[PDB]
Amino acid sequence: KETAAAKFERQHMDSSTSAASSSNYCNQMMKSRNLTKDRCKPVNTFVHESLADVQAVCSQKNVACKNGQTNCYQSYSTMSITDCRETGSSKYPNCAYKTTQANKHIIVACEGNPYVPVHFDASV
């Protein structure tokens, strides 16, 4: 099966652009990363930084995860992100999204040996 680390890269990493390409970005990316296959995933974040810089977050500020686990880490620096949020007109299988670009600190959950990001928790 797809590993947890590989799943994080598919769902959340987009190092090819530095910021939300266009108004069409979320529509294109949610579909191409297979996040609209079984349903319209209602919310998702993509991070526009190098893989190395995102993996380094697992050695930064330890904080509580939203689920109460203690394996979450917050980035010291801000990072370029794009939030995708399901619009009102959206109806499966024709999923539709609004694209919003921001610069925020990211919070990720880490696991494994090597210790790497496995889930995206929040941005602040």
UniProtKB/Swiss-Prot annotation:
Disulfide bonds join C26-C84, C40-C95, C58-C110, C65-C72. Glycans are attached at K1, K7, N34, K37, K41. It is an enzyme of class 4 (lyase). Changing H12A: Loss of activity. Substrate binds at K7, R10, K41, P42, V43, N44, T45, K66, R85. Its EC number is 4.6.1.18. Belongs to the pancreatic ribonuclease family. This is Ribonuclease pancreatic. It comes from Bos taurus (Bovine). The chain holds residues 27 to 150 of 150 of the full protein.
